[PDB]
Amino acid sequence: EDPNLLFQSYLDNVGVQIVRQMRSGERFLKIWSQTVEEIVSYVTVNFPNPP
Amino acid sequence: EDPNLLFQSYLDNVGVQIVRQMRSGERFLKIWSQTVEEIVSYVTVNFPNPP
């Protein structure tokens, strides 16, 4: 299956998590900083190390 | 970790853009519809395709 379809579907879910956390009253930088860690981890293991 | 750190720096900066747009009156999911495409594009162009 296409790696980009998989990544885009992961990002869709990431967006839901952000909407849910914002509704709970968490500050965006706090939510986003956790999300950045997850996305970087996703790419680190699903895409070859960049040149 | 230059390419991986360059990617994390990119996403942290994407976070500031998102908050600035939301502080400008825009809704997160509207911003996210465009941000997910920009993030997928970044990885497709700057990282090799998975084998």
From Swiss-Prot, chains A, B:
Signal peptide location: none
Post-translational modification: Phosphorylated by host PKC and by an unknown kinase.
Consequence of changing V36I: In strain: Isolate PM1503
Superkingdom: Viruses
Family from the record: Belongs to the lyssavirus protein P family.
Role played: Non catalytic polymerase cofactor and regulatory protein that plays a role in viral transcription and replication. Stabilizes the RNA polymerase L to the N-RNA template and binds the soluble protein N, preventing it from encapsidating non-genomic RNA. Also inhibits host IFN-alpha and IFN-beta signaling by binding and retaining phosphorylated STAT1 in the cytoplasm or by inhibiting the DNA binding of STAT1 in the nucleus. Might be involved, through interaction with host dynein, in intracellular microtubule-dependent virus transport of incoming virus from the synapse toward the cell body.
Name recorded for this polypeptide: Phosphoprotein
Residues of the full protein shown: 87 to 137 of 297
